[PDB]
Design a protein around this nucleic acid. Structure first.
Ligand SMILES: [Mg+2]
Ligand SMILES: [Mg+2]
Ligand SMILES: [Mg+2]
Ligand SMILES: [Mg+2]
Ligand SMILES: [Mg+2]
Ligand SMILES: [Mg+2]
Ligand SMILES: [Mg+2]
Ligand SMILES: [Mg+2]
Ligand SMILES: [Mg+2]
Ligand SMILES: [Mg+2]
Ligand SMILES: [Mg+2]
Ligand SMILES: [Mg+2]
Ligand SMILES: [Mg+2]
Ligand SMILES: [Mg+2]
Ligand SMILES: [Mg+2]
Ligand SMILES: [Mg+2]
Ligand SMILES: [Mg+2]
Ligand SMILES: [Mg+2]
Ligand SMILES: [Mg+2]
Ligand SMILES: [Mg+2]
Ligand SMILES: [Mg+2]
Ligand SMILES: [Mg+2]
Lengths: 62, 62, 119, 106
RNA sequence: GAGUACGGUAGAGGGUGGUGGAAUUUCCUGUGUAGCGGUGAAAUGCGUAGAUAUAGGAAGGAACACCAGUGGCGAAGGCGACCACCUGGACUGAUACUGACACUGAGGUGCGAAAGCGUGGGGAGCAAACAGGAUUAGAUACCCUGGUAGUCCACGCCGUAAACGAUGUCGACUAGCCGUUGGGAUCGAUCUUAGUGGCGCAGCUAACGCGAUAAGUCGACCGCCUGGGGAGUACGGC
């Protein structure tokens, strides 16, 4: 996220966000995607924030 | 934890794929976690022991 | 005396560490037939085995064959044994399974569970 | 004033007065002295879960400059309307003007 | 040395409001019929007055899965849903400014987990006391079925914990190696800064062990100890 684009991960860009959520709907741990801790925290807050607006589901089932 | 039977595969592939998805989702672990109340002292102790074992194993690899 | 016909039903398996409950319904959630492990004649430590779940699933399927029901979706819920013997017995009854789902309820924070047993 | 970013989705059956509601909202902060920097209408989408037993909504995204009075009155307008359904106010430290996703799909 | 002015970062630091989703329990209704629940095995208990199961609707309270990590912030106690508002400190870079303005601290003042107490709200889950069922020689227990104060909120008191790193605060020096958190530079690599972990040379220790986050070598100030019980008890004071 530091090379060229996304200075701060945005809740609106669903394409980036969907790459970091599993098929169940949970947030993938940083030890799997290799993401840095600071950017992982930004992903967590972005995913929750988009989840509130119903852009992304809380759970696959609902 | 939800599969479909698609294009007439036998009912042994579907069952094993369902089992694999259930294992990946960590369903039974979640159910066993909340069977009883684990007081925060015990939870902190478990986390500390897990961290100690994780670091020792990671160090031993080299 | 009265009868009915229905196809493309939904089978709910409710597993637990003590007993399993099988219930075939239509897609609207209206029960047609049901069977358990305690009703199949095990009644104790034998009630908590995948064999009892298999027997219960076959009994419930044979009870529900009256309506037809050539198609079934499956909803499994519970941690107990028989989580899979019922599913493999249901097709052995002679059904065709469209899909299988797991609908176990997981609290996010929820209420607090009981104390830990000191055995 | 202060910069603010607002995501505001509307009940699908009311998705015909949404534009008029938009300029009505803009007016009050205009005569208050506020500003508009970005306005975007990317509504008529599919909800990820049922909200008040509906599955579609009309999304609007607005970046504004406002003071406490203007924000409070706009937020009350959100409170007591019946097409408001859901809301989010997410103050930013700067101003942005150039799109979020629009309709990237061809 | 100690502080001030100026850009910028990271954060479960604090306070006041509002709003989410998952799940439990109760109530109403439809389908449907004889079991459910529990255990090492049982039984009490719940069901043909229609339970358990399944579907639709409603109310209400509390705790915030995944992210989550020998991670972060705070003087300590401690702080995990999201958003707005009010607010404290820390880290980081350059230039300028004041000119010893510092350290410690008996009394004293303030913050201080949980349980507890007073007044007024609230009541889902759990659960001291309590009741029943088992086990047992007995069982005022462990286990099972229920269940009240309490757990939640506002204001006030209490001022105690294995309140622990069982290690008072401040400052200066002493080989190295491997991680990780928040920043800087130079050309993924090197250097450096404030935290957080695992090893380890000297040195220290009764030993275990510590080892730049010393229990090493030195300074400044404070608290405390003098065999085990009686006893952190008796009497007096607050
Ligand atoms: Mg129990
Ligand atoms: Mg029911
Ligand atoms: Mg319901
Ligand atoms: Mg004092
Ligand atoms: Mg208390
Ligand atoms: Mg009390
Ligand atoms: Mg009392
Ligand atoms: Mg009281
Ligand atoms: Mg009271
Ligand atoms: Mg009870
Ligand atoms: Mg009270
Ligand atoms: Mg003491
Ligand atoms: Mg002590
Ligand atoms: Mg010291
Ligand atoms: Mg010190
Ligand atoms: Mg010291
Ligand atoms: Mg020192
Ligand atoms: Mg060492
Ligand atoms: Mg010593
Ligand atoms: Mg003596
Ligand atoms: Mg005394
Ligand atoms: Mg006295």
């Amino acid at each position: 996220f530091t090379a060229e684009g996304v200075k701060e991960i945005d809740y609106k860009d669903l394409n980036t966000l969907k790459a970091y959520v599993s098929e169940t709907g949970k947030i993938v741990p940083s030890r799997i995607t290799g993401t840095k801790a600071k950017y992982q925290r930004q992903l967590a807050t972005a995913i929750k924030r988009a989840r509130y607006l119903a852009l992304l589901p809380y759970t696959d089932s609902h | 934890p939800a599969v479909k039977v698609k294009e007439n595969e036998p009912f042994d592939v579907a069952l094993r794929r369902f089992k694999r998805s259930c294992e990946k989702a960590g369903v039974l672990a979640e159910v066993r976690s909340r069977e009883f109340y684990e007081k925060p002292t015990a939870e902190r102790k478990r986390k500390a022991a897990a961290a100690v074992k994780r670091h020792a194993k990671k160090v031993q690899r080299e | 005396k009265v009868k009915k016909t229905v196809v493309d039903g939904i089978a709910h398996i409710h597993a637990s560490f003590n007993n399993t409950i099988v219930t075939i319904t239509d897609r609207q959630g209206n029960a047609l037939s049901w069977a358990t492990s305690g009703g199949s004649g095990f009644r104790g430590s034998r009630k908590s085995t995948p064999f009892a779940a298999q027997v219960a699933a076959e009994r419930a399927g044979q009870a529900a064959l009256e309506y037809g029901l050539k198609n079934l979706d499956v909803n499994v819920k519970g941690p107990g044994p028989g989580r899979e013997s019922a599913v493999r017995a249901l097709n052995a009854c002679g059904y065709k399974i469209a899909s299988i789902t797991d609908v176990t309820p997981i609290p996010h924070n929820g209420c607090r569970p009981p104390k830990k047993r000191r055995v | 004033m202060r910069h603010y970013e607002i995501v505001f989705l509307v009940h699908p059956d009311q998705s015909e007065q949404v534009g008029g509601m938009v300029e009505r909202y803009t007016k009050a902060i205009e005569e208050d002295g506020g500003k508009i920097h970005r306005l975007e209408d990317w509504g008529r989408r599919q909800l990820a879960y049922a909200i008040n037993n509906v599955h579609k909504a009309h999304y609007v995204l607005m970046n504004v400059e406002c003071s406490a009075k203007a924000l409070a009155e706009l937020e009350d307008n959100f409170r007591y309307n019946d097409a408001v359904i859901r809301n989010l106010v997410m103050r930013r430290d700067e101003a942005v003007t150039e799109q979020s996703e629009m309709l990237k799909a061809e």
